[PDB]
Nucleic acid binder design. Structure first.
Ligand SMILES: [Cl-]
Ligand SMILES: [Cl-]
Ligand SMILES: [Cl-]
Ligand SMILES: [Cl-]
Ligand SMILES: [Cl-]
Ligand SMILES: [Cl-]
Ligand SMILES: [Cl-]
Ligand SMILES: [Mg+2]
Ligand SMILES: [Mg+2]
Ligand SMILES: [Mg+2]
Ligand SMILES: [Mg+2]
Ligand SMILES: [Mg+2]
Ligand SMILES: [Mg+2]
Ligand SMILES: [Mg+2]
Ligand SMILES: [Mg+2]
Ligand SMILES: [Mg+2]
Ligand SMILES: [Mg+2]
Ligand SMILES: [Mg+2]
Ligand SMILES: [Mg+2]
Ligand SMILES: [Mg+2]
Ligand SMILES: [Mg+2]
Ligand SMILES: [Mg+2]
Ligand SMILES: [Mg+2]
Ligand code: NA
Ligand code: NA
Ligand code: NA
Ligand code: NA
Ligand code: NA
Ligand code: NA
Ligand code: NA
Ligand code: NA
Ligand code: NA
Ligand code: NA
Ligand code: NA
Ligand code: NA
Ligand code: NA
Ligand code: NA
Ligand code: NA
Ligand code: NA
Lengths: 142, 142, 150, 49
RNA sequence: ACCCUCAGAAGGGAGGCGAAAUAGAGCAUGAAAUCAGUUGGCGAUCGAGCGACAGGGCAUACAAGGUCCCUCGACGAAUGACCGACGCGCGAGCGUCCAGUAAGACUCACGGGAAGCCGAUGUUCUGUCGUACGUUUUGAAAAACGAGCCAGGGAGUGUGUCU
RNA sequence: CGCUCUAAUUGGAUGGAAGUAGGGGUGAAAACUCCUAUGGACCGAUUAGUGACGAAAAUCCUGGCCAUAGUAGCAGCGAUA
RNA sequence: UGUCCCAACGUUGGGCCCGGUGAACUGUACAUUCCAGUGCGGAGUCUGGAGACACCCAGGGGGAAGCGAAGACCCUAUGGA
């Protein structure tokens, strides 16, 4: 609730990794970022394999644990965590000043970062984070 | 009603342009602690320096992070080596006679700690008349 | 033995010490810890409650295997060291005694300082199996107490 | 014979003790033992002239 | 000694002697390991050879160190431009000139400033590097061997002969 | 570089030596030195000598000490008191 | 015939809490780990990730190639008996 994001990025039809990479870069530069429409971000490849990767991650674990998110919410955020030294003081700060959301809880429409947009017209082999999450067993709360 | 050090405490030696450059170098560059390897890991092991002799010693092998090894390359500039920070050359003094031959422009004097108060007062007063600063002065209340 | 480790103004101060008491040095630490800042009077009441088994002495450092006590606040383990407590009640009786004979109101005085110190051990030897023997000692405790007018 | 006046013997391996000659459970004779002999001491035989 | 306390020739308090009792009886001095209380720093969301070198926070009686900070200006090694003008290149961009100029570590001069203030010390934070020590070993952080911690002790000496 | 004691030469100390604790300065360094506190009687330098002269280690020796832990044992036995 | 199918309930002493007494083993250091990797090829400490708020009580003992014993096996020694 209420997040003074200096930047509001829109993930709809954007390549998760590429976006996540740019969001980390900024959060490390001090920017407070908020990612919007996570459920609508995308990742290229052959759905079948992509899903396998993530389903595996959900299954990996033990007493010590390996908590992996199933909501496009978490998914996106953990992706960003991977692009930051989240265990160093500076990195936890940056990571913490970053939040992902399902849909867009703001008034302003977020911005689309350069080179992260995917062309549905010239691209058929890709997936929606939400599709992924539905396959993971997540509850479609969006 | 306040303490005042005897003698020419403020006195400053006069040094060639070169010497003052070199003295200022020494003070800028500094040198490493050169403490014994791992003295901080074991109480029984004192700080005094001993050459690391372990065939495997990380320091003896020069592994960055294990400390600097004593070498001649670390020596101080010939011209200044041994000078008190003020630039003065010290002269150890035990009595009044020792004051003879001392250039109060070039050398300051340090009274052996053993010398008792009585002989101090004599040395300290004649030292000042001879234009020589005493590095370890008595503080009297004036 | 010890010597007062703190400076006390004689005009507003009463003192007292226990010498080489053979009792748990670990209990003393806890007891001292617990009663400092209290009123000599409050202290006595407390230690008597402890001896009674109604008030527990928080054991914060030497608590291994000690069972939790409901009455301990902010902590969990604690016991009722009656021996050590009694020796403290002797220390207190003495301090409040000296305090009155000096014109103060003993009981009303604040425990400005109280500390226990292990002065030694009365050495003992316990026969063990296999023809060998091992130590079986007794701690010897000293304890300082300084009373101060409110 | 300073420090040698003893029948002290070392138990050898077996009791988790260093091989040091002992007697009545007290180490003896060897230089590194309190009350043991002095390794290389001053000698009457030496020519100091 | 005397007085108070205490079950008390104990102990404690107050007091007395002495230069000193922190010289009060295994009583000169009184280290380290270590214990109690306590001050400074850190601290119950976070990672382990415990540090070295850099740089920040906080903390600091005197003494034995006195430096340090900013404007500007002087000097200025290697290195070394932006902009703009012209000319190339599909393009990223390059060439010529402006220019070996502006810049450029250290050091110094004028002016202004700091006294916890600079150094230094304690602790803590960040950066870089970093799996003890010694030994055995081709190869040891080693799941090879040794040590709980500290202090003290602990290993090329003498005679004769030869060279 | 540092230690012991001997010698020659030459100094310091009850107007406070050695040692110790904390702290300032020098030396690439072994280590040297100063200040404060403690201590209360000894202590250096230079030169030439001297040697039971330097430790982190040896399942090293001796003493002291911390954790272990207010933990194990103080129940088990044909005598449950 | 509770050896077993297949375990249950009960008795006594312990165990647990409290007063008193009060050891030993063991300790290079650091140490909340887990999955992998790597490394003298059998890592709490390296590398990558994951996980992880601190302390305490009880437990049965997975791991510390746990503690205990300078391997009895095997070989080597111009060793012993
Ligand atoms: Cl899991
Ligand atoms: Cl990190
Ligand atoms: Cl496609
Ligand atoms: Cl040299
Ligand atoms: Cl104890
Ligand atoms: Cl310069
Ligand atoms: Cl030799
Ligand atoms: Mg040490
Ligand atoms: Mg228990
Ligand atoms: Mg027997
Ligand atoms: Mg002897
Ligand atoms: Mg004494
Ligand atoms: Mg917190
Ligand atoms: Mg091998
Ligand atoms: Mg020694
Ligand atoms: Mg001479
Ligand atoms: Mg021992
Ligand atoms: Mg236990
Ligand atoms: Mg019966
Ligand atoms: Mg890791
Ligand atoms: Mg063997
Ligand atoms: Mg055989
Ligand atoms: Mg034979
Ligand atoms: Na992808
Ligand atoms: Na998982
Ligand atoms: Na505890
Ligand atoms: Na409570
Ligand atoms: Na409680
Ligand atoms: Na004998
Ligand atoms: Na042993
Ligand atoms: Na002779
Ligand atoms: Na600091
Ligand atoms: Na070895
Ligand atoms: Na090693
Ligand atoms: Na290994
Ligand atoms: Na032990
Ligand atoms: Na020797
Ligand atoms: Na049965
Ligand atoms: Na286990």
């Amino acid at each position: 609730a209420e997040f003074d994001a200096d930047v509001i990025v829109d993930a709809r039809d954007c390549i998760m990794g590429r976006v996540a990479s740019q969001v980390a870069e900024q959060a490390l530069d001090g920017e407070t970022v908020a990612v919007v429409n996570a459920e609508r971000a995308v990742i290229t490849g052959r759905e079948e394999q992509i899903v396998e990767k993530y389903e595996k991650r959900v299954d990996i674990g033990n007493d010590n644990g390996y908590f992996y998110p199933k909501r496009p919410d978490g998914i996106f955020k953990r992706t960003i965590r991977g692009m930051l030294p989240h265990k160093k003081q500076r990195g936890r700060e940056a990571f913490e000043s970053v939040r992902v959301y399902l849909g867009n809880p703001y008034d302003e429409d977020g911005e689309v970062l350069d080179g992260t947009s995917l062309d549905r017209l010239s691209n058929i082999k890709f997936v929606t984070l939400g599709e992924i999450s539905e396959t993971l067993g997540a509850n479609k709360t969006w | 009603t306040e303490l005042q050090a005897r003698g020419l405490t403020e006195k400053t030696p006069d040094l060639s342009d070169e010497d003052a450059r070199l003295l200022t170098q020494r003070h800028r560059v500094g040198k490493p602690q050169f403490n014994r390897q791992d003295h901080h890991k074991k109480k029984r092991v004192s700080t005094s320096w001993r050459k690391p002799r372990g065939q495997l010693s990380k320091q003896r092998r020069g592994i960055k992070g294990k400390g600097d090894t004593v070498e001649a390359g670390f020596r101080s500039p010939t011209a200044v080596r041994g000078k008190h920070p003020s630039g003065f050359e010290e002269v150890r003094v035990h009595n009044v006679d020792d004051l003879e031959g001392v250039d109060g422009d070039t050398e300051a004097v340090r009274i052996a700690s053993k010398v008792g108060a009585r002989k101090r007062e004599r040395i300290e007063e004649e030292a000042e008349d001879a234009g020589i600063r005493v590095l370890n002065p008595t503080y009297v209340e004036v | 033995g010890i010597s007062y480790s703190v400076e006390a103004d004689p005009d507003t101060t009463a003192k007292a010490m226990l010498r080489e008491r053979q009792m748990s040095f670990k209990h003393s630490k806890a007891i001292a810890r617990e009663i400092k800042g209290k009123t000599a009077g409050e202290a006595v009441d407390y230690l008597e409650a402890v001896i009674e088994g109604d008030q527990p002495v928080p054991f914060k450092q030497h608590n291994s295997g000690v069972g939790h006590k409901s009455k301990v606040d902010g902590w969990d383990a604690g016991r009722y060291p009656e021996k050590a407590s009694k020796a403290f009640l002797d220390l207190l009786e003495n301090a409040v005694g000296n305090a009155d004979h000096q014109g103060f109101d003993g009981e009303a005085m604040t425990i400005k300082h109280v500390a226990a110190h292990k002065v030694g051990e009365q050495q003992g030897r316990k026969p063990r199996a296999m023809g060998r023997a091992s130590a079986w000692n007794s701690p010897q405790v000293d304890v300082e107490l300084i009373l101060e007018e409110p | 014979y300073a420090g040698l006046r003893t029948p002290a013997e070392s138990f050898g391996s077996g009791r988790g003790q260093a091989h040091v000659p002992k007697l009545d459970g007290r180490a003896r004779r060897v230089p590194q033992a309190v009350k043991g002999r002095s390794a290389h001491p001053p000698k009457t035989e030496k020519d100091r002239s």
